[PDB]
Amino acid sequence: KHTEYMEFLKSVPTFQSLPEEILSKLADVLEETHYENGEYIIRQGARGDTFFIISKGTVNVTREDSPDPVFLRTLGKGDWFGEKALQGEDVRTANVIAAEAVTCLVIDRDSFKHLIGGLDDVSNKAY
Numbered sequence: 001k002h003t004e005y006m007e008f009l010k011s012v013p014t015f016q017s018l019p020e021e022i023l024s025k026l027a028d029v030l031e032e033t034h035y036e037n038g039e040y041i042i043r044q045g046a047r048g049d050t051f052f053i054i055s056k057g058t059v060n061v062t063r064e065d066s067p068d069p070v071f072l073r074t075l076g077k078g079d080w081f082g083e084k085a086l087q088g089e090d091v092r093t094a095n096v097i098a099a100e101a102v103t104c105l106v107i108d109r110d111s112f113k114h115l116i117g118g119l120d121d122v123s124n125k126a127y
């Protein structure tokens with residue numbers, strides 16, 4: 001699966017410019033987690049320490065605005081989420097629910113901070 005992960009990581013726009021050794025270290029520390037259509041992956045308001053990369057399926061992002069949660073957007077394979085709880089405060093700013101059978105590759109804070117955190121595309125991420 002290490003080779004499987006590495007060729008997947010090389011296909012994502014955000015991670016293909018990273019030295020191969022860093023991609024190798026990521027593929028060794030990530031965890032594969034699976035969800036079913038409608039399952040909550042992330043709940044707004046919880047405190048989190050994990051970043052997610054979608055390797056299969058799609059998810060729906062909703063968020064209770066200041067003014068009922070509002071449908072925000074859909075993310076699919078190759079997309080990633082969960083970076084906000086990893087920048088500054090550790091609170092999740094939105095819900096992310098599985099929209100079908102989903103597989104996510106999960107990286108914890110310890111790994112994110114050393115391997116992914118200094119990436120322009122993710123730190124300079126604006127919605």
Ligand SMILES: Nc1nc2c(ncn2[C@@H]2O[C@@H]3COP(=O)(O)O[C@H]3[C@H]2O)c(=O)[nH]1
Pocket residue numbers: 042048061063072073080081082083084085086091092093094095096127
């Ligand atoms: N707050 C917010 N999060 C979004 C949006 N679109 C996708 N997300 C993801 O939803 C995630 C919820 O967990 P995080 O707040 O850690 O990180 C968030 C983002 O990666 C959006 O328009 N607003």
Ligand code: NA
Pocket residue numbers: 084085086087088089090091
């Ligand atoms: Na934050």
